[PDB]
Amino acid sequence: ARAXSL
Amino acid sequence: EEHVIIQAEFYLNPDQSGEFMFDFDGDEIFHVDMAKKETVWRLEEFGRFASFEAQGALANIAVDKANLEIMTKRSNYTPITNVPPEVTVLTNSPVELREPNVLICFIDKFTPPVVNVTWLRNGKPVTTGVSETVFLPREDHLFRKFHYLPFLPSTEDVYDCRVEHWGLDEPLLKHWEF
Amino acid sequence: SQPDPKPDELHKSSKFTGLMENMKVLYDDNHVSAINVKSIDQFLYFDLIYSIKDTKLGNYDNVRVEFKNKDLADKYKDKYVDVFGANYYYQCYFSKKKRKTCMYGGVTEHNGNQLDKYRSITVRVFEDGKNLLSFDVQTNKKKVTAQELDYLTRHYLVKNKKLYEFNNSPYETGYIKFIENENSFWYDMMPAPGDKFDQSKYLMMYNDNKMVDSKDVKIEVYLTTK
Amino acid sequence: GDTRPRFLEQVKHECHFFNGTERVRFLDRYFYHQEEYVRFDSDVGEYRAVTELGRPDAEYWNSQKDLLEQKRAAVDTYCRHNYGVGESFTVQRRVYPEVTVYPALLVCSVNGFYPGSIEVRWFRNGQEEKTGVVSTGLIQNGDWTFQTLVMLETVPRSGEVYTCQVEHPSLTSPLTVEWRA
């Protein structure tokens, strides 16, 4: 699983 | 839609508490224990089918804290308005004497994501085998939470899920009995 | 206190297939060291952030110190302390309020813990049961973290005994034992089995901020050759 | 109690899937408390402020081409990728329901099933009962299982046969539990 925080 | 996968995160001040989880169609796939830095799969079996670098989650929470501070100031320090939880207690399965069951305390539609949940059996606190979920996200952006109490149904026991939340003046007790 | 390593309990370097360099760097020249500082922030309730400048190579300006619990963080939050620890960068994340590093424990209150001169602590090194090397490590702290002594001990061993090399190690097993008044505890010096080494998770062993009395502690390193 | 002000930041990276992964919509959402102030919608392709407090972010973020580049590829590198990774134990998850019928008013309790899609019908003498049937609705137990109760208000005839029938993706055919008065 890949995590996507600006 | 058929399915929705959501990576939900939050950071709360002054509590300094944070959360990072993945939700699939409303159910928690996993959340990250930021202290032990481990991926906590909602169902153990999940860990055998997939993986996730828990530590990568801290990067997000770090940014979220930073963003919270920026937004806090931008809103001219406008605090969150407490939204009390609606609490429901039900069993996960039909009740039969002498047949193990689980009392489910469904804490719903609340914010901020901070709550004290206690189980009372005959007026006394019970911790034996209890468990809970982290704060689950809602589409209205409030939170849901589940607390569980395995129990052996008896005609002589009464239970209460006691919920403490800043949206409530006093602890809320939801009763259950056979 | 803690029972010595049982058979097959210690990590076998041979069973580690990743790069030992990742372990080596934790005990190379660089480390975090600050004297008489007070936390200036917090990311999570169990950590403290210190404003510490990397004066050996300026890789950071802030250091995140994570503890095993909120109690430790609270205990030192407003205390002027000395910080000493093996730090890491991969998976090091935290928000303050040009860069940063992370570590665990390694904190001791400054005031009342200083010695006017450096005290030596003996380290006896055993290679397959043979004491071919013994040396002292120094500290001017009455109470020092095991982490600091461990770091000083291993770093000397890296330079002098090639404890950790780029690919693997000339030693199969290795544990460092701290003895103080007929009481002891030890740490496994080798990486967990597998093709990857998690620096942050390994260093997490220091998050209990365990300390020892510099006056009474003795160190013993047991290494097995391959 | 503790009445100190609370300030909450929420971020939701959503992946909405249609017809498998044929159509995927990625939403990068930022909330202050419960208020979403900025979001990136893959159907839009750039960050758009949702409230004035978001404008600052929508501007700085769209200014970074490597950033918008990442977000625009999200439907593939993030959503489709994760969908593939968790498909076998989420999308394909099928746990069959257990059906229990007991006298309350007859109660048909369907428990432990997944996914949520389910059909529960009450039959009386082989005919489906429509009137006098009440359902608690779908209930999420929070442990990847659902439960639902369907009640039937009735007045059984001598030896009347009531049947609770359940249809669910996990089962090839309906699951039936018959209760005879």
mmCIF file of all heavy atoms in Angstrom, chain C residues 16 18-27 164-167 191 195-199:
data_model
loop_
_atom_site.group_PDB
_atom_site.id
_atom_site.type_symbol
_atom_site.label_atom_id
_atom_site.label_comp_id
_atom_site.label_asym_id
_atom_site.label_seq_id
_atom_site.Cartn_x
_atom_site.Cartn_y
_atom_site.Cartn_z
ATOM 1 N N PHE C 16 21.464 -11.672 8.139
ATOM 2 C CA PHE C 16 21.086 -10.344 7.691
ATOM 3 C C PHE C 16 21.692 -10.219 6.304
ATOM 4 O O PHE C 16 22.903 -10.315 6.150
ATOM 5 C CB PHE C 16 21.664 -9.267 8.603
ATOM 6 C CG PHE C 16 21.457 -7.878 8.083
ATOM 7 C CD1 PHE C 16 20.174 -7.357 7.939
ATOM 8 C CD2 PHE C 16 22.540 -7.102 7.696
ATOM 9 C CE1 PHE C 16 19.979 -6.080 7.412
ATOM 10 C CE2 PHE C 16 22.353 -5.825 7.168
ATOM 11 C CZ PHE C 16 21.078 -5.316 7.026
ATOM 12 N N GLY C 18 20.944 -7.518 4.128
ATOM 13 C CA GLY C 18 20.970 -6.152 3.639
ATOM 14 C C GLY C 18 22.370 -5.592 3.806
ATOM 15 O O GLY C 18 23.319 -6.347 4.007
ATOM 16 N N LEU C 19 22.509 -4.275 3.714
ATOM 17 C CA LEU C 19 23.808 -3.647 3.890
ATOM 18 C C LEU C 19 24.037 -3.276 5.353
ATOM 19 O O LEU C 19 23.278 -2.507 5.936
ATOM 20 C CB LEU C 19 23.922 -2.399 3.017
ATOM 21 C CG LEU C 19 24.085 -2.711 1.530
ATOM 22 C CD1 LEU C 19 23.983 -1.437 0.702
ATOM 23 C CD2 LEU C 19 25.422 -3.401 1.313
ATOM 24 N N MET C 20 25.085 -3.838 5.942
ATOM 25 C CA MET C 20 25.437 -3.557 7.325
ATOM 26 C C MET C 20 25.790 -2.073 7.457
ATOM 27 O O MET C 20 25.773 -1.515 8.551
ATOM 28 C CB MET C 20 26.631 -4.418 7.741
ATOM 29 C CG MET C 20 26.907 -4.430 9.240
ATOM 30 S SD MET C 20 25.494 -5.030 10.225
ATOM 31 C CE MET C 20 25.507 -6.802 9.753
ATOM 32 N N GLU C 21 26.115 -1.434 6.335
ATOM 33 C CA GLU C 21 26.458 -0.012 6.343
ATOM 34 C C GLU C 21 25.374 0.790 7.068
ATOM 35 O O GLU C 21 25.661 1.776 7.746
ATOM 36 C CB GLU C 21 26.597 0.502 4.911
ATOM 37 C CG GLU C 21 27.006 1.964 4.797
ATOM 38 C CD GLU C 21 28.436 2.226 5.277
ATOM 39 O OE1 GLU C 21 29.224 1.267 5.395
ATOM 40 O OE2 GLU C 21 28.779 3.398 5.517
ATOM 41 N N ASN C 22 24.125 0.357 6.912
ATOM 42 C CA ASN C 22 22.991 1.031 7.547
ATOM 43 C C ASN C 22 23.024 0.938 9.072
ATOM 44 O O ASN C 22 22.405 1.746 9.772
ATOM 45 C CB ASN C 22 21.670 0.461 7.010
ATOM 46 C CG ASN C 22 21.444 0.809 5.543
ATOM 47 O OD1 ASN C 22 21.734 1.924 5.121
ATOM 48 N ND2 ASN C 22 20.917 -0.138 4.769
ATOM 49 N N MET C 23 23.737 -0.054 9.583
ATOM 50 C CA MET C 23 23.867 -0.220 11.021
ATOM 51 C C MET C 23 25.114 0.556 11.398
ATOM 52 O O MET C 23 25.132 1.314 12.364
ATOM 53 C CB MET C 23 24.033 -1.695 11.382
ATOM 54 C CG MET C 23 24.484 -1.937 12.826
ATOM 55 S SD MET C 23 23.281 -1.471 14.093
ATOM 56 C CE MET C 23 22.235 -2.904 14.122
ATOM 57 N N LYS C 24 26.154 0.379 10.596
ATOM 58 C CA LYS C 24 27.418 1.056 10.828
ATOM 59 C C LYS C 24 27.260 2.565 11.025
ATOM 60 O O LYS C 24 27.796 3.128 11.981
ATOM 61 C CB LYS C 24 28.366 0.793 9.662
ATOM 62 C CG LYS C 24 29.745 1.390 9.839
ATOM 63 C CD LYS C 24 30.651 1.042 8.657
ATOM 64 C CE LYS C 24 32.073 1.528 8.892
ATOM 65 N NZ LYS C 24 32.122 2.986 9.159
ATOM 66 N N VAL C 25 26.531 3.216 10.122
ATOM 67 C CA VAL C 25 26.349 4.659 10.204
ATOM 68 C C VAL C 25 25.716 5.125 11.508
ATOM 69 O O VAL C 25 25.873 6.282 11.889
ATOM 70 C CB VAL C 25 25.500 5.216 9.027
ATOM 71 C CG1 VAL C 25 26.235 5.012 7.705
ATOM 72 C CG2 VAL C 25 24.124 4.547 9.000
ATOM 73 N N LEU C 26 24.991 4.240 12.186
ATOM 74 C CA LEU C 26 24.364 4.621 13.446
ATOM 75 C C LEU C 26 25.450 4.741 14.509
ATOM 76 O O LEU C 26 25.283 5.423 15.529
ATOM 77 C CB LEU C 26 23.327 3.579 13.874
ATOM 78 C CG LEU C 26 22.180 3.335 12.891
ATOM 79 C CD1 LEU C 26 21.162 2.418 13.530
ATOM 80 C CD2 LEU C 26 21.535 4.660 12.498
ATOM 81 N N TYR C 27 26.569 4.076 14.268
ATOM 82 C CA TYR C 27 27.662 4.134 15.220
ATOM 83 C C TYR C 27 28.958 4.650 14.614
ATOM 84 O O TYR C 27 30.048 4.282 15.051
ATOM 85 C CB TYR C 27 27.859 2.765 15.859
ATOM 86 C CG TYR C 27 26.615 2.300 16.570
ATOM 87 C CD1 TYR C 27 25.669 1.507 15.918
ATOM 88 C CD2 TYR C 27 26.354 2.697 17.880
ATOM 89 C CE1 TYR C 27 24.494 1.123 16.558
ATOM 90 C CE2 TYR C 27 25.189 2.318 18.523
ATOM 91 C CZ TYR C 27 24.264 1.536 17.863
ATOM 92 O OH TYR C 27 23.111 1.183 18.519
ATOM 93 N N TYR C 164 31.142 -3.194 12.366
ATOM 94 C CA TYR C 164 30.195 -3.129 11.269
ATOM 95 C C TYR C 164 30.958 -2.645 10.057
ATOM 96 O O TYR C 164 31.754 -1.709 10.149
ATOM 97 C CB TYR C 164 29.076 -2.141 11.573
ATOM 98 C CG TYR C 164 28.343 -2.408 12.868
ATOM 99 C CD1 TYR C 164 28.302 -1.446 13.870
ATOM 100 C CD2 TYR C 164 27.674 -3.612 13.079
ATOM 101 C CE1 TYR C 164 27.603 -1.675 15.057
ATOM 102 C CE2 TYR C 164 26.980 -3.855 14.248
ATOM 103 C CZ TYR C 164 26.942 -2.885 15.239
ATOM 104 O OH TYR C 164 26.237 -3.135 16.400
ATOM 105 N N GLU C 165 30.720 -3.293 8.928
ATOM 106 C CA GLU C 165 31.369 -2.914 7.689
ATOM 107 C C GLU C 165 30.281 -2.578 6.675
ATOM 108 O O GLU C 165 29.091 -2.635 6.988
ATOM 109 C CB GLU C 165 32.247 -4.062 7.197
ATOM 110 C CG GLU C 165 33.306 -4.453 8.220
ATOM 111 C CD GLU C 165 34.152 -5.627 7.777
ATOM 112 O OE1 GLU C 165 33.623 -6.756 7.722
ATOM 113 O OE2 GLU C 165 35.345 -5.421 7.477
ATOM 114 N N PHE C 166 30.687 -2.234 5.460
ATOM 115 C CA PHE C 166 29.724 -1.865 4.431
ATOM 116 C C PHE C 166 28.676 -2.935 4.123
ATOM 117 O O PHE C 166 27.479 -2.663 4.133
ATOM 118 C CB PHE C 166 30.446 -1.496 3.142
ATOM 119 C CG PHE C 166 29.526 -1.012 2.066
ATOM 120 C CD1 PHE C 166 28.916 0.233 2.169
ATOM 121 C CD2 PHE C 166 29.238 -1.813 0.968
ATOM 122 C CE1 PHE C 166 28.027 0.679 1.196
ATOM 123 C CE2 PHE C 166 28.348 -1.376 -0.014
ATOM 124 C CZ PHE C 166 27.744 -0.126 0.104
ATOM 125 N N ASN C 167 29.128 -4.152 3.846
ATOM 126 C CA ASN C 167 28.202 -5.233 3.525
ATOM 127 C C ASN C 167 27.683 -5.995 4.738
ATOM 128 O O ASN C 167 26.474 -6.086 4.955
ATOM 129 C CB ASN C 167 28.860 -6.202 2.545
ATOM 130 C CG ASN C 167 29.089 -5.577 1.185
ATOM 131 O OD1 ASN C 167 28.143 -5.158 0.515
ATOM 132 N ND2 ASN C 167 30.344 -5.506 0.772
ATOM 133 N N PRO C 191 21.780 -6.607 13.455
ATOM 134 C CA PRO C 191 20.529 -6.315 12.757
ATOM 135 C C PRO C 191 19.618 -7.521 12.777
ATOM 136 O O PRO C 191 20.093 -8.648 12.881
ATOM 137 C CB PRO C 191 20.985 -6.012 11.332
ATOM 138 C CG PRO C 191 22.371 -5.528 11.496
ATOM 139 C CD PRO C 191 22.925 -6.461 12.536
ATOM 140 N N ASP C 195 16.567 -8.812 4.520
ATOM 141 C CA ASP C 195 17.301 -7.997 3.566
ATOM 142 C C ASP C 195 17.219 -6.501 3.853
ATOM 143 O O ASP C 195 17.802 -5.691 3.131
ATOM 144 C CB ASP C 195 16.797 -8.279 2.150
ATOM 145 C CG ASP C 195 15.415 -7.721 1.903
ATOM 146 O OD1 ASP C 195 14.516 -7.961 2.736
ATOM 147 O OD2 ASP C 195 15.226 -7.045 0.868
ATOM 148 N N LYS C 196 16.500 -6.125 4.904
ATOM 149 C CA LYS C 196 16.376 -4.711 5.243
ATOM 150 C C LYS C 196 16.658 -4.438 6.714
ATOM 151 O O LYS C 196 16.399 -5.276 7.576
ATOM 152 C CB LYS C 196 14.974 -4.192 4.892
ATOM 153 C CG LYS C 196 14.788 -2.699 5.169
ATOM 154 C CD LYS C 196 13.395 -2.201 4.781
ATOM 155 C CE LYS C 196 12.307 -2.833 5.640
ATOM 156 N NZ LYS C 196 12.452 -2.489 7.087
ATOM 157 N N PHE C 197 17.208 -3.263 6.994
ATOM 158 C CA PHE C 197 17.496 -2.879 8.365
ATOM 159 C C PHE C 197 16.762 -1.582 8.649
ATOM 160 O O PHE C 197 16.947 -0.587 7.949
ATOM 161 C CB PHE C 197 19.000 -2.686 8.586
ATOM 162 C CG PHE C 197 19.342 -2.199 9.968
ATOM 163 C CD1 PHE C 197 18.989 -2.938 11.089
ATOM 164 C CD2 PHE C 197 19.967 -0.974 10.146
ATOM 165 C CE1 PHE C 197 19.248 -2.454 12.365
ATOM 166 C CE2 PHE C 197 20.229 -0.486 11.414
ATOM 167 C CZ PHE C 197 19.871 -1.222 12.520
ATOM 168 N N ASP C 198 15.912 -1.609 9.668
ATOM 169 C CA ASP C 198 15.139 -0.439 10.046
ATOM 170 C C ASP C 198 15.884 0.302 11.149
ATOM 171 O O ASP C 198 15.804 -0.071 12.319
ATOM 172 C CB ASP C 198 13.761 -0.861 10.548
ATOM 173 C CG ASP C 198 12.794 0.304 10.635
ATOM 174 O OD1 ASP C 198 13.222 1.408 11.031
ATOM 175 O OD2 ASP C 198 11.602 0.108 10.319
ATOM 176 N N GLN C 199 16.609 1.348 10.770
ATOM 177 C CA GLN C 199 17.381 2.133 11.726
ATOM 178 C C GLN C 199 16.502 2.673 12.852
ATOM 179 O O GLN C 199 16.800 2.468 14.031
ATOM 180 C CB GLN C 199 18.071 3.292 11.011
ATOM 181 C CG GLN C 199 19.031 2.855 9.920
ATOM 182 C CD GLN C 199 19.586 4.019 9.122
ATOM 183 O OE1 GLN C 199 18.851 4.936 8.752
ATOM 184 N NE2 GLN C 199 20.887 3.980 8.833
#
